[PDB]
Write a protein that holds these residues in place. Structure first.
Motif, PDB file in Angstrom:
ATOM      1  N   UNK A 209       8.940   2.811  -1.656  1.00  0.00           N
ATOM      2  CA  UNK A 209       8.249   2.660  -2.439  1.00  0.00           C
ATOM      3  C   UNK A 209       6.915   1.771  -1.240  1.00  0.00           C
ATOM      4  N   UNK A 210       6.597   1.260  -2.349  1.00  0.00           N
ATOM      5  CA  UNK A 210       5.254   0.815  -1.556  1.00  0.00           C
ATOM      6  C   UNK A 210       4.903  -0.708  -2.428  1.00  0.00           C
ATOM      7  N   UNK A 211       4.023  -1.583  -1.729  1.00  0.00           N
ATOM      8  CA  UNK A 211       3.598  -2.746  -2.455  1.00  0.00           C
ATOM      9  C   UNK A 211       1.917  -2.801  -2.943  1.00  0.00           C
ATOM     10  N   UNK A 212       2.331  -2.982  -4.262  1.00  0.00           N
ATOM     11  CA  UNK A 212       1.416  -2.707  -5.411  1.00  0.00           C
ATOM     12  C   UNK A 212       0.426  -4.215  -5.600  1.00  0.00           C
ATOM     13  N   UNK A 213       0.721  -5.247  -5.447  1.00  0.00           N
ATOM     14  CA  UNK A 213      -0.026  -6.529  -5.273  1.00  0.00           C
ATOM     15  C   UNK A 213       0.446  -7.986  -3.936  1.00  0.00           C
ATOM     16  N   UNK A 214       0.170  -8.246  -2.757  1.00  0.00           N
ATOM     17  CA  UNK A 214       0.913  -9.025  -2.250  1.00  0.00           C
ATOM     18  C   UNK A 214      -0.272  -9.691  -1.929  1.00  0.00           C
TER      19      UNK A 214
ATOM     20  N   UNK B 273       0.522  -2.564 -11.345  1.00  0.00           N
ATOM     21  CA  UNK B 273       0.361  -3.904 -11.447  1.00  0.00           C
ATOM     22  C   UNK B 273      -1.455  -4.367 -11.122  1.00  0.00           C
TER      23      UNK B 273
ATOM     24  N   UNK C 231      10.374  -6.288  -3.293  1.00  0.00           N
ATOM     25  CA  UNK C 231       9.855  -4.857  -2.088  1.00  0.00           C
ATOM     26  C   UNK C 231       8.338  -4.808  -2.983  1.00  0.00           C
ATOM     27  N   UNK C 232       7.650  -4.739  -3.943  1.00  0.00           N
ATOM     28  CA  UNK C 232       7.010  -4.578  -4.403  1.00  0.00           C
ATOM     29  C   UNK C 232       5.636  -5.351  -4.483  1.00  0.00           C
ATOM     30  N   UNK C 233       6.114  -7.067  -4.148  1.00  0.00           N
ATOM     31  CA  UNK C 233       5.229  -7.623  -4.100  1.00  0.00           C
ATOM     32  C   UNK C 233       4.862  -8.331  -2.641  1.00  0.00           C
ATOM     33  N   UNK C 234       5.654  -8.592  -1.581  1.00  0.00           N
ATOM     34  CA  UNK C 234       5.557  -9.200  -0.259  1.00  0.00           C
ATOM     35  C   UNK C 234       5.463 -10.365  -0.446  1.00  0.00           C
ATOM     36  N   UNK C 235       4.679 -11.650   0.212  1.00  0.00           N
ATOM     37  CA  UNK C 235       3.928 -12.447  -0.163  1.00  0.00           C
ATOM     38  C   UNK C 235       4.931 -14.048  -0.401  1.00  0.00           C
TER      39      UNK C 235
END
Lengths: 335, 223, 132, 17, 101, 35
Positions: free
Chosen positions: D3-8, E1, A247-251
């Motif tokens: 929550x929120x995506x830190x890196x994508x 991160x 959930x913090x990465x997506x991709x």
RNA sequence: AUGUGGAACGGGGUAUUGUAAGCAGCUGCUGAGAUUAAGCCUUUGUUCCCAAGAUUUG
RNA sequence: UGUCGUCGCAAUGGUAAUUCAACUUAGUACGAGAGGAACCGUUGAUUCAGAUCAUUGGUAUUUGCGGCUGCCUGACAAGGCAAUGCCGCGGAGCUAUCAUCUGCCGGAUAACGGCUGAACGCCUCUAAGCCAGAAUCCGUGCCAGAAAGCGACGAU
RNA sequence: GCCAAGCGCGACGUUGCUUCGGCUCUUCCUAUCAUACCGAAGCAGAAUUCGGUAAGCGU
RNA sequence: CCCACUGUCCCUAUCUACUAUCUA
RNA sequence: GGAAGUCGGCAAAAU
């Protein structure tokens, strides 16, 4: 030397790690399974938030190496009834399903190709002709036997393994009355049981398997071992494309690292990610069992929410998670 | 003056930082220190239990005033986002990329005038003036470059090392435009900033601070 | 000291000459023994960043030499893996001359300071110049 | 609370928003 | 991160990967692999080193202010990131075609 | 320190089985069971 | 003992090294070229192979 | 044991975990003051044991790539060389408390503290009986599986 | 020597005076240094001292 | 004695040939 | 790290 509890140090007499103890049965708990069979693919490293109260890295993140085991759904092909006797447990009788896949039929033969494929032929004939014998045997198990173990085999075809023989084994059916276990086995005859239905990624399980052989040393290696308290971090689904996407990465990506798992291939079915190392090299079958004794300390009880899962090229010094972003950063190739 | 000790340490200034508009406490330790801070300033100013750089040294690493706050470049992106979310919008938060990340141990700043380390960068001084909106003076405290650690600065008074000369103490007081006292805290601990944190209306000192030291601080701060 | 410390790669064994990072005037520090060592057979005690050991001032002023007295290692040459996963190695092995209570004997520290050491010893963090 | 995506996609969403 | 950029290859450095090195000037060097860590060690200038991004940049071959959380802003940023990358990919392809021509 | 066979430790393990364990694991098995 | 069969190569992915020969005016073709299972992954690519000998067994 | 094979049973043998300081309970119980506990709960670290190779370091016969020296083809180039000529990098493998994971539960007791209770019309932890209780003991868990222990099942 | 239950001795008491030698290694014993649990002591607490069970585990 | 140096050691790990092994 | 090994810089590398 080492511990005297592991001698005599000799080769394990089985390729597949056999369960030597199952969790104690309970009538209060309803009917379920306790063990599963998977194949080791390798491990990666992941970044995970640390919600460990009282620790010095509380509300922080750490990097953990986590083993990936492909666990395609297992097919229940039979049931075995065990009766308690003054000389121990004894297999009273065994009831098999009518139709058995070639994966589990290949187990009974050393040379399946040269064989006449005669396994369970008359058994299937008598199953279709008269079901009174099957009813008599199932009534026998639910009336006399006190322990019920379902015969289940792994779908080795889905795994990228050249081996075609399925690792048939027994899973003890812990929960409910003996009749409840028998009814559960009959309903699940010829069907598939999924690891998502067995384990749920936040409990504390044990992994058992045979270690890798180191040759001759001044015998050392290839021994049956039992790792206790190996935490599941994620039971990813093969069909879902978000299995390796947190959930913090997506991709959007897959658990199989770019370049493929070294000497195993590409994981396409449901996989299990366990913290720390596990016995056996890649492509070896591993067995998972529940906790025999209940012990959930803070490490074994705290929830886990993954943040980023590495999928770099484990073959060599990989430096790109997916070829997509690799092409975004790297200049356009000549091809 | 309130006596408190974080864990088993009397250097409360190392594990926490105090301003005139917000308070910061360490994360991952004992909640008793945060409760003690909230008991005296929770109803007055917000208190954020966070960490900078994954350590409990945020008190000596972060320096700022009631207007703005500065954090070292080692602060994580998630940590900065958490700090901004917890802190009020009028409280500006800025990251500083300086060769000496210990902002709290290098620079001591008040609501109107700030004293920085002699080797502070020009860009850092410009950022401090822009954010804190205070006059920055490049000097030294008791002949030591660690002015932010060897001196305690506040709106109503200042504390310096007792080994400083009378003329030097008078010059520093005139430069700071506030009374200055050359003394020791926490029973001789020469690091006044580490051993005590003073806000505009309240001050917190270590549990090992003597009664004479507490009385001197109360007289200096007029609290 | 204050707080726990994680398992660390050991790279400063006994019989080691190790740089002095304080302003007290000492130049070289000599490791004699390591505090808190177990009963391990044929194992040389070793030190790492944030560890306090018995050290002697080899080069410095006459009054600080010839004293078997504690010193905290702040920089380590050998690469170590922090629990966050990153690997760190410093150019030299720097140390600070410290009283057994845990208070900085000097007034200023030269060079970078390990974050674990600043976290472990509050006085070191107070007197640290930069902690990266 | 969410929550929120830190890196994508190889880019830090938090640092680029 | 934060996925950092290596000092030498200028490529993406992810957690666990590579090595971290701190200078006495408190300047930090991150290396994407042992090869690039070693290449810093005997002090080869990236711009002279053929396969580095610094070479490919200077040879013609190619937020410190925190922001309050907002769900709409994050969604807009995520949606715009893919479009920006697609535009960058198209520009790089045109540049590669021009270089080949 | 006391070993893992410490009689009091076994007693405290028994006490904590019904405090931070047991029920939250039984229904946990139930949930994946009805699945 | 005819198959998501096998083996030889080949393509692709991935990796290591560091921009190849050759051509032109250090630069460009060229992060190109080479190597890549020998205990990496994959293959709607090509070719070939197998529907057997011997032994033992109520 | 018809024969072969699969899944198991467990007689019996072996056993494994050790120690420390930090948080909280605390600056409370207690103490003129000086000082200052402990139990539950929690986090780390030593010693040992069993594994593992994601990351990091080491390793070079990948004689994998590049560079250098020298030699041989009349020359250019082209190559090939040199007991593994020399140097840099180097996968794969091996490997490292130079890297990482994991290390369990029940009773029965000793010392000792007791309950009921005679002997001995009182009394008594003891005589018959019964609790509490040591890192001890015996099991569980873990390893081996009787190659002259055995069961169920499939085919014939 | 003085007593001296008793059977001339005479116990307990009482008076005087003063070549060997050591590294590794394996196990084993407990006559226990540490770890575990108890008992006592002017043992407030803490730190101890003495005495039991105890060779599991180290030294 | 100082300085330098190194697998002597912490603490071993990897590679190569030969040996070692089997076959006639 | 640099003789902490062993009765000991024996052998190597350093020069």
């Amino acid at each position: 030397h080492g511990s005297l509890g592991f001698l005599p140090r000799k080769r394990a007499s089985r390729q597949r790690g056999k369960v030597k103890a199952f969790p104690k049965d309970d009538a209060s708990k309803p009917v379920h399974l306790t063990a599963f069979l998977g194949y080791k693919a390798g491990m990666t490293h992941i970044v995970r938030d640390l919600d460990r109260p009282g620790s010095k890295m509380h509300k922080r993140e750490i990097l953990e190496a986590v083993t990936v085991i492909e666990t395609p759904p297992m097919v229940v092909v039979g049931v075995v009834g065990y009766v308690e006797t003054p000389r121990g447990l004894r297999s009273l009788t065994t009831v098999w399903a009518e139709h058995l896949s070639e994966e589990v039929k290949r187990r009974f033969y050393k040379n399946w190709f040269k064989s006449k494929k005669k396994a369970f032929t008359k058994y299937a004939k008598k199953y279709a002709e008269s079901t009174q014998s099957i009813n008599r045997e199932l009534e026998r198990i639910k009336k006399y036997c006190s322990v019920v173990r379902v015969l289940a085999h792994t779908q080795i075809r889905k795994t990228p393994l050249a081996q075609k023989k399925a690792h048939l084994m027994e899973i003890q059916v812990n929960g409910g009355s003996v009749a409840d276990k028998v009814e559960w086995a009959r309903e699940h005859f010829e069907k598939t049981v999924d690891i998502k239905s067995t384990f749920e990624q936040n409990e504390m399980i044990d992994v058992i398997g045979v270690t890798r052989g180191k040759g001759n040393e001044g015998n050392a290696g290839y021994m049956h071992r039992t790792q206790l308290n190996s935490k599941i971090y994620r039971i990813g689904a093969g069909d879902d494309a978000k299995n390796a996407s947190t959930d913090f990465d997506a991709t959007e990506k897959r658990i199989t690292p770019m370049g493929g798992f070294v000497r195993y291939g590409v994981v396409e079915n449901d996989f299990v990610m366990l913290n720390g190392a596990t016995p056996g090299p890649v492509k070896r079958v591993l067995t998972l069992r529940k906790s025999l004794l209940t012990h959930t300390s803070r490490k074994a009880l705290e929830p886990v929410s993954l943040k980023w899962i590495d999928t770099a090229s484990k073959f060599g010094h990989g430096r790109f998670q997916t070829p997509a972003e690799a092409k975004q950063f790297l200049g356009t190739l000549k091809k | 003056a309130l006596r408190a000790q974080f864990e088993n340490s009397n250097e409360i200034g190392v594990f926490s930082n105090l301003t005139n508009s917000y308070a910061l406490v360490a994360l991952g330790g004992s909640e008793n220190f945060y409760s003690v801070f909230e008991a005296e300033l929770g109803d007055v100013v917000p208190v954020v239990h966070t960490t900078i750089g994954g350590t409990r040294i945020i008190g000596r690493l972060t320096c700022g005033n009631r207007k703005g706050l500065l954090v070292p470049s080692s602060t994580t992106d998630n940590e900065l986002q958490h700090l901004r979310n917890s802190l009020p919008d009028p409280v500006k938060i800025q990251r500083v990329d300086e060769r000496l990340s210990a902002l709290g141990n290098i620079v001591a700043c008040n609501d109107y005038v700030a004293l920085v380390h002699p080797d502070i960068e020009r860009e850092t001084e410009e950022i401090i003036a822009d954010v804190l909106d205070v006059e920055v003076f490049r000097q030294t405290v008791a002949g030591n470059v660690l002015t932010g650690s060897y001196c305690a600065l506040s709106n109503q008074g200042a504390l310096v090392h007792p080994r400083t000369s009378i003329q030097e103490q008078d010059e520093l007081s005139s430069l700071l435009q506030v009374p200055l006292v050359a003394g020791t805290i926490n029973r001789g601990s020469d690091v006044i900033g580490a051993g005590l944190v003073v806000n505009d209306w309240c001050a917190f000192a270590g549990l090992d601070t003597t009664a004479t030291e507490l009385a001197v601080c109360e007289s200096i701060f007029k609290l | 000291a204050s707080g726990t410390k994680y398992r660390m790669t050991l790279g400063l064994p006994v019989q080691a000459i190790m740089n002095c990072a304080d302003n007290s005037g000492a130049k070289n520090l000599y490791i004699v023994s390591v505090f808190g060592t177990g009963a391990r057979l044929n194992r040389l005690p070793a030190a790492s960043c944030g560890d306090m050991v018995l050290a002697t001032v080899k080069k410095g002023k006459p009054d600080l030499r010839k004293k078997i007295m504690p010193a905290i290692v702040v920089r380590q040459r050998k690469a170590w893996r922090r629990k966050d996963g990153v690997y760190l190695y410093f150019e030299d092995n720097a140390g600070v001359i410290v009283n057994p209570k845990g208070e900085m004997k000097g007034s200023a520290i030269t060079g970078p300071v390990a974050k674990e050491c600043a976290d472990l010893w509050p006085r070191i963090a107070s007197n640290a110049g930069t902690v990266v | 609370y969410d929550r929120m995506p830190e890196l994508l996609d190889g880019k830090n969403v938090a640092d680029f928003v | 991160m934060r996925v950092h950029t290596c000092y030498f290859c200028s490529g993406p450095v992810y957690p666990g990967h590579g090595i971290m090195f701190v200078r006495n000037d408190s300047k930090v060097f991150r290396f994407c692999r042992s090869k690039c860590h070693k290449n810093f060690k005997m002090k080869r200038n990236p711009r002279k080193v053929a396969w580095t991004k610094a070479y490919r940049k200077a040879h013609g071959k190619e937020r410190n202010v925190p922001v309050r959380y907002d769900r709409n802003v994050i969604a807009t940023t995520l949606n715009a990131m893919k479009r920006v990358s697609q535009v960058h990919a198209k520009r790089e392809r045109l540049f590669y075609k021009k270089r080949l021509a | 320190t006391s070993g893992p066979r410490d009689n009091n430790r076994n007693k405290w393990a028994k006490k904590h089985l019904k405090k931070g364990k047991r029920a939250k694991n039984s229904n946990f098995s139930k949930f994946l069971k009805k699945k």
